[PDB]
């Protein structure tokens, strides 16, 4: 339609972790809905079935199962071709809808052993390993760098289990969050008066509020509308930041186009003559 503006983007900054950008000339409802997709709708792989062969550790089993689900997983190369479990024709699991992990550790040593993310092995090809320590010429590598201490073991304890990771999205459980956090900010100088400051001098100025380097603090304009939203998406590490954004928009496109097909389905099946 003629009244659609088609927005604008600017990437301010990009790292292996963060992606920080500005969206301009669009609606808040778009900005807010797109921020919500970054959390909930972007799909990923995380452990979903844990089968415990032997567990002599001082942590109870369901605790091991909890810590273990929550650990992060690379998915970028494979999260797309993977299908959803319920949709897949197979009974239980298969190579085509899930990937398998195996963990086997025993404390035969006199010193306390730690159980870590590297000790967890993918029966699936090393296309989808755990996040830490793989093709890592990584300056983030410090001391142990176990990514997670699944448990500690004293001389005699042992741990054997199987796990099946599956594709799903954050609306269903928090283990599937593809974000470390999501900053969102709009109209930093409070031109539009969406908040009303009592004694405005008592508030600090963000890094976006510099435009009024002065201390005049918030010049008013009532003919304005919300424009130019600032973002900073931050990667949990399990999916690189730009891929989070591109997959979010596509998923949102997929969800919208589908609602259009059902709305079409109303005009095709049960001919739209009710109203």
């Amino acid at each position: 339609m003629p009244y659609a503006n088609q927005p604008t983007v600017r990437i301010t900054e990009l790292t292996d972790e963060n992606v920080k950008f500005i969206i301009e000339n669009t609606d808040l409802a778009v900005a807010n809905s797109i921020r919500r997709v970054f959390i909930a709708e972007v799909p990923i792989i995380a452990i979903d079935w844990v089968q415990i062969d032997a567990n002599s550790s001082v942590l109870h089993d369901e605790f091991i199962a909890h810590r273990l689900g929550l650990i992060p997983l690379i998915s970028d190369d494979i999260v797309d071709k993977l299908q959803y479990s319920r949709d897949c024709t197979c009974e239980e699991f298969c190579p085509e809808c899930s990937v398998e992990f195996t963990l086997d550790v025993r404390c035969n040593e006199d010193q306390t052993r730690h159980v870590t993310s590297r000790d967890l092995i993918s029966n699936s090809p090393r296309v989808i390993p755990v996040t830490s320590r793989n093709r890592d010429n990584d300056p983030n590598d410090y001391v142990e760098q176990d990514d997670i201490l699944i448990v500690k073991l004293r001389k005699g304890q042992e741990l054997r289990l199987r796990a099946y990771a599956k594709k799903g999205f954050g609306k269903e459980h928090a283990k599937w969050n593809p974000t470390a956090g999501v900053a969102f900010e709009y109209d930093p100088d409070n031109a539009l008066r969406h908040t009303v400051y009592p004694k405005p001098e008592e508030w600090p100025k963000s890094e976006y509020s510099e435009l009024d380097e002065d201390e005049s603090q918030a010049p008013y304009d009532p003919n304005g509308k919300p424009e130019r939203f600032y973002y900073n998406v931050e990667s949990c590490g399990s999916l690189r930041p730009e891929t989070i954004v591109l997959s979010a928009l596509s998923g949102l496109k997929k969800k919208l186009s589908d609602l259009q097909t059902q709305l079409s389905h109303e005009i095709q099946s049960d001919v739209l003559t009710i109203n």
């Binding site: 995380a46 844990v50 199962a65 005699g156 283990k175």
Partner: protein, 46 residues
Amino acid sequence: QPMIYICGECHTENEIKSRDPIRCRECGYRIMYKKRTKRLVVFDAR
């Protein structure tokens, strides 16, 4: 079929699998602790 029955501290099977009185051979303790089932269960990482 055996009913195992690991004992306290000795860390070995008691092995008792019948009506005879409970007491771990070699080890002086008389508390038992029936061993884990080999039967598979499952746990969701949700």
